[PDB]
């Protein structure tokens, strides 16, 4: 059984448990005549609980119920401090679901008999989840937060609600309103948590206190994408220096956002959120003029020196293809099969010879230089974790498949090598197509060359793949098809279908009009044969073909503001990456100091406006 | 003569006897004094009616009249109720119309004449035809529920209108609500007409009261696709449990959705309705959180090992092709003809063998699956009648079409075997094709093949057969024309046009650029070729083809709500088609029950909802 289903199973045997005792029917009736009556000839002990395990509290508070609550706990003083404890509503008190509901009244009424404000709601289904429509935290305090009522949060921190409490997540109170859809009322709320945490120091104060996962709430505002809560807390950490006119020179602070740190760096986490909304913070004005400070300084030019090494690897690396040891056919082995093309094998002659020592340092090159990218690539998979790695196309993406598939076949070549292995196209061939088509990772500068090489990436995996299986499916159709037509016929005349596995290839290369329609003029082709042909060419390049122009033309212009909004998040990602890779010994880092500027010892950006 | 013809000779006919008779000529005018004066001195009897066959009642009501209405029947007592007596117009009362006029005191003063409220309206102009702008039944309550005039409805059900009454297609006055274009104002008029509906169970109630076509009227807002009265049946059939903040667990009814039914599913009209606004039924919030659970649950892994069972049936099938009975050519016949290629001929040795006897438990694998698929068609040709089913292209489609001209092919080839008949690869050349094109209908799940074969299956119905009408009358004009300048030449040099069918099969494939230009340069080819071929080459690759990638490319944008929202509709009709199929030892039925849950019988459905 699913949970969703065992959930449905537990959500309506309470609903039987209502039904079945008059005492929970009259709790969510508001029948105040009969909980008087109820009450005084023997009333009933309250073990007699629900099917999630609640009293009838919890019943009376989860509808709106001042007068059946109170009624209740006149009668049983012994029910604010009681919890349901059923497995995924483990720890909901009545306070739980009163301030859920905004019943200002009935959360007086609990406080004021003691219920206790920092009780933790550790149920399975209060936890966040893809499958659970709120996440609110666990404490009252949090679930009074998220709500937006703030009469109700202010009444629990004169009870003592700690808003330095941490849920199983670790998420404070502010981290769970960065985390909420209602972004604008969320910023009310966090000016208000603010002025009740007076107390300071106990542990980097209210705000910088981290996740379990290390996520500070202003570094979770990156990774969840909130610009409105982004700027809000912006605003603590920026000087307005002087308004000269319409300028403003305001002076940001830039330490939260600046890493200085060891791995938790705010723009690593930014471009590599798995979240859609969080490539907006990279266009928040204290943001969008520091990385683009980092690339046109020092980014852009370190990335176009590495660009113009890594041609000049694989220029080199062509070369020493090109110019490869291959003898003279030394056998007449060609004289039986003729219909083999071959000619020289293979060679073990880097040693006698002078222009393949000119090649030997070359391919030492090329073997110590695809070394260098498995020492590069290999400590950076263990890093994210292997597989978001490889599918952000943000965060390198499917470069690095490309990358270590590429350097992998140039150290096959050198063990096709050395022990004097046969085959050795085959891994060069494939080394050749993937080393070039790796080179399309340096158009990661370039504006002109872009977003240009996104589409590429974009409209290879969405909409070449699944025009791709309905091609398959086609050139099966009649490349199985045109074999059995050509099955009866002699192969020296329309030989195009002699084989199965030329059939496919044959049809395939026919669907894209490359090869031209099989037909000889001399001999009488069968007449199968051009019907099943005009079905073809009908399906095959009317068809088939032009729709993929309109299916690659239509979603072209739907990703337009999104493959080029998607260029800017990847040149944030290329820098990031470059800092840490290539030494301090290179980049300084970035903003003015403040210690000979002195007033602290933060590093600020400065930023000048204009007021329109 | 058209039947639009002959009513207007009807409607204009009424105007003629109107200014004959003086009588009829003030009825319109509401002259009082004339009135007054005409019926004193003997009276005219009141036989002398209209051409239509109505009395001066009828025309004094199809105009506002009061006055002129109330002078005609102290008269004469005897005329309100009279009806009219043309064939199109029949039984249509004074009173039919002075309800459609909303004239409330004409209502009055009929009802307290004795006017029938029961009246049958069954006139050949008011039954529901597309050349009707208006249906509203038969009955003179029908006609004020749809004219919005709850002034009317209340006043005809004070002197004995019956609500459960049924007209000529067997619609109830609830039935026609639905039907009305007007839909915001008819879930006022249903609220209306249930409250003067106490009596009850004669008959399931007013609402469970089936058509002729067995519609409910709940039935009917799904076929019709009026998501505005769905939304309003449903109010009655769901229970809400409780808000626990922004949450709503809401619990559905699911008995008149859900089949458990016979052949009348909802869910089966809904998908297979003509009408294009029932696809918006299948958004509605508990049918959507049904399908969804249906499809993800049981239909989705159902149709997952469905379709690879028929990939590896197509993947038995060709195999069982490739390898096919083919001798050696035992005859020296290709010596004479050398235009002749042809080999091998076909082979009576299904026995004499060690690996034909593996091919043969592989034929009978695609005999024995293609006699399954048709007793899996033909019992579901009759059950939709044969010409719906094939055009719907949510409801299989052309993909029934295909696959049982696929298994139509398969026998006919066990047929040319065990008679030893000759042109076997006509049929297996057919069957490879269109059994492949088959597996295409099992990209019905696969969201990433999903809409995109709808597409094929759109542009190939619309804009690719107007796009291969105007190619025939192109490549027959010039395959025609090349024809004759080459008519003259010597086949052996520029052969492509050597006979009239391949000289419309080579500019065919000239008109898709597959064929190159036809051009021997070591012959002088005809002047006349080079005029014609530059003619064709900007009409046929420059003007035509690209052309058509723009009217693939401009009718692929417009359908892209419409490609995408026929998709989920095609998922819901996959679902509805499998639970029919496969047996239930399978698909336990949907929603949670309730006979352990103690309130009812019925199956409920739990959905849980997020005020934002």
């Given at each position: 059984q699913d949970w969703e289903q065992y959930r449905d199973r537990v959500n309506m045997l309470q609903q039987e448990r209502i039904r079945d005792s008059p005492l929970l029917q009259a709790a969510k009736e508001n029948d105040l005549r009969l909980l008087k009556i109820l009450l005084l000839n023997q009333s009933c002990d309250f073990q007699q609980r629900g099917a999630?395990?609640?009293?009838?509290?919890?019943?009376?508070?989860?509808?709106d119920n001042l007068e059946a609550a109170t009624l209740l706990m006149e009668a049983a003083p012994e029910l604010a401090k009681e919890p349901a404890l059923c497995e995924p509503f483990v720890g909901q008190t009545a306070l739980h679901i009163a301030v859920m509901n905004q019943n200002l009244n009935l959360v007086r009424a609990l406080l004021a008999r003691g219920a206790s404000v920092s009780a933790r709601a550790t149920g399975a289904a209060f936890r966040r989840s893809p499958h659970n429509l709120i996440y609110y935290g666990e404490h009252p305090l949090s679930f009074a937060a998220c709500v937006?009522?703030?009469?109700?949060?202010?009444?629990?921190?004169?009870?003592?609600?700690?808003?330095?409490?941490?849920?199983?997540?670790?998420?404070?109170?502010?981290?769970?309103?960065?985390?909420?859809?209602?972004?604008?009322?969320?910023?009310?709320?966090?000016?208000?948590?603010?002025?009740y945490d007076e107390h300071s120091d106990h542990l980097q104060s209210l705000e910088l206190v981290p996740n379990h996962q290390g996520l500070t709430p202003f570094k979770l505002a990156g990774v969840e994408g909130n610009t409105v809560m982004f700027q809000h807390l912006m605003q603590k950490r920026k000087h307005v220096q002087w308004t000269c006119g319409p300028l403003t020179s305001t002076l940001y602070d830039l330490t939260e956002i600046d890493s200085w740190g060891e791995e938790l760096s705010f723009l690593e986490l930014v471009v590599s959120?798995?979240?859609?909304?969080?490539?907006?913070?990279?266009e928040q004005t204290p943001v969008k003029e520091l990385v683009s400070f980092k690339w046109k300084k020092y980014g852009r030019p370190y990335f176009c020196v590495l660009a113009s090494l890594y041609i000049l690897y694989m220029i080199?690396?062509?070369?020493?293809?090109?110019?490869?040891?291959?003898?003279?056919?030394?056998?007449?082995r060609t004289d039986p099969?003729?219909?083999?093309?071959?000619?020289?094998?293979?060679?073990?002659?880097?040693?006698?010879?002078?222009?393949?020592?000119?090649?030997?340092?070359?391919?030492?090159?090329?073997?110590?230089?695809?070394?260098?990218?498995?020492?590069?690539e290999i400590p950076d998979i263990f890093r994210v974790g292997a597989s978001r790695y490889f599918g952000q196309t943000i965060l390198g993406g499917p470069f690095h498949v490309i990358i270590i598939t590429y350097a992998s076949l140039?150290?096959?070549?050198?063990?096709?090598?050395?022990?004097?292995?046969?085959?050795?196209?085959?891994?060069?061939?494939?080394?050749?197509?993937?080393?070039?088509?790796?080179?399309?990772?340096?158009?990661?500068?370039?504006?002109?060359?872009?977003?240009?090489?996104?589409?590429?990436?974009?409209?290879?995996?969405?909409?070449l793949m699944r025009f791709c299986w309905l091609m398959a499916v086609v050139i099966l159709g009649f490349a199985s098809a045109f074999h059995i037509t050509f099955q009866t016929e002699d192969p020296n005349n329309l030989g195009e279908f002699s084989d199965y596995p030329t059939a496919l290839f044959s049809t395939f290369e026919l669907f894209l009009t490359i090869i031209d329609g099989p037909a000889n003029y001399s001999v009488d082709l069968p007449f199968m044969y051009c019907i099943t042909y005009a079905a073809f060419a009908i399906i095959a390049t009317l068809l088939m073909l032009n729709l993929f122009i309109a299916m690659m033309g239509d979603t072209h212009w739907r990703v337009a503001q999104e493959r080029d909004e998607l260029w800017r998040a990847q040149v944030v990602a290329t820098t990031v990456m470059l800092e840490r890779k290539m030494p301090r010994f290179?980049?300084?880092?970035?903003?003015?100091?403040?210690?000979?500027?002195?007033?602290?010892?933060?590093?600020?950006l400065r930023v000048e406006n204009h007021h329109d």
């Amino acid at each position: 059984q699913d949970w969703e289903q065992y959930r449905d199973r537990v959500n309506m045997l309470q609903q039987e448990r209502i039904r079945d005792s008059p005492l929970l029917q009259a709790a969510k009736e508001n029948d105040l005549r009969l909980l008087k009556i109820l009450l005084l000839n023997q009333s009933c002990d309250f073990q007699q609980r629900g099917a999630v395990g609640e009293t009838a509290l919890h019943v009376a508070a989860l509808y709106d119920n001042l007068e059946a609550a109170t009624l209740l706990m006149e009668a049983a003083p012994e029910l604010a401090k009681e919890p349901a404890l059923c497995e995924p509503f483990v720890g909901q008190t009545a306070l739980h679901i009163a301030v859920m509901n905004q019943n200002l009244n009935l959360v007086r009424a609990l406080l004021a008999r003691g219920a206790s404000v920092s009780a933790r709601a550790t149920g399975a289904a209060f936890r966040r989840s893809p499958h659970n429509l709120i996440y609110y935290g666990e404490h009252p305090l949090s679930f009074a937060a998220c709500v937006g009522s703030e009469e109700i949060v202010r009444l629990l921190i004169e009870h003592g609600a700690d808003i330095r409490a941490q849920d199983s997540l670790g998420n404070t109170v502010l981290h769970i309103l960065i985390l909420q859809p209602n972004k604008t009322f969320a910023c009310q709320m966090y000016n208000l948590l603010l002025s009740y945490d007076e107390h300071s120091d106990h542990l980097q104060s209210l705000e910088l206190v981290p996740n379990h996962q290390g996520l500070t709430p202003f570094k979770l505002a990156g990774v969840e994408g909130n610009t409105v809560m982004f700027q809000h807390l912006m605003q603590k950490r920026k000087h307005v220096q002087w308004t000269c006119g319409p300028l403003t020179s305001t002076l940001y602070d830039l330490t939260e956002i600046d890493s200085w740190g060891e791995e938790l760096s705010f723009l690593e986490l930014v471009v590599s959120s798995k979240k859609r909304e969080a490539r907006q913070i990279l266009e928040q004005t204290p943001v969008k003029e520091l990385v683009s400070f980092k690339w046109k300084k020092y980014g852009r030019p370190y990335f176009c020196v590495l660009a113009s090494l890594y041609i000049l690897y694989m220029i080199c690396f062509t070369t020493c293809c090109i110019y490869r040891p291959l003898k003279l056919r030394d056998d007449n082995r060609t004289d039986p099969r003729d219909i083999t093309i071959l000619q020289q094998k293979l060679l073990q002659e880097a040693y006698v010879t002078h222009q393949d020592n000119i090649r030997l340092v070359g391919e030492l090159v090329t073997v110590t230089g695809a070394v260098i990218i498995l020492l590069l690539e290999i400590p950076d998979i263990f890093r994210v974790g292997a597989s978001r790695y490889f599918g952000q196309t943000i965060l390198g993406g499917p470069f690095h498949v490309i990358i270590i598939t590429y350097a992998s076949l140039v150290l096959l070549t050198m063990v096709m090598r050395l022990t004097n292995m046969n085959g050795e196209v085959v891994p060069l061939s494939f080394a050749l197509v993937l080393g070039w088509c790796s080179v399309m990772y340096f158009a990661r500068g370039f504006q002109m060359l872009g977003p240009f090489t996104i589409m590429i990436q974009k409209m290879i995996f969405g909409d070449l793949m699944r025009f791709c299986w309905l091609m398959a499916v086609v050139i099966l159709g009649f490349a199985s098809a045109f074999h059995i037509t050509f099955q009866t016929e002699d192969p020296n005349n329309l030989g195009e279908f002699s084989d199965y596995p030329t059939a496919l290839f044959s049809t395939f290369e026919l669907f894209l009009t490359i090869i031209d329609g099989p037909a000889n003029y001399s001999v009488d082709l069968p007449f199968m044969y051009c019907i099943t042909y005009a079905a073809f060419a009908i399906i095959a390049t009317l068809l088939m073909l032009n729709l993929f122009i309109a299916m690659m033309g239509d979603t072209h212009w739907r990703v337009a503001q999104e493959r080029d909004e998607l260029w800017r998040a990847q040149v944030v990602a290329t820098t990031v990456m470059l800092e840490r890779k290539m030494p301090r010994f290179l980049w300084p880092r970035s903003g003015i100091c403040g210690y000979e500027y002195g007033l602290g010892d933060r590093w600020f950006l400065r930023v000048e406006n204009h007021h329109d």
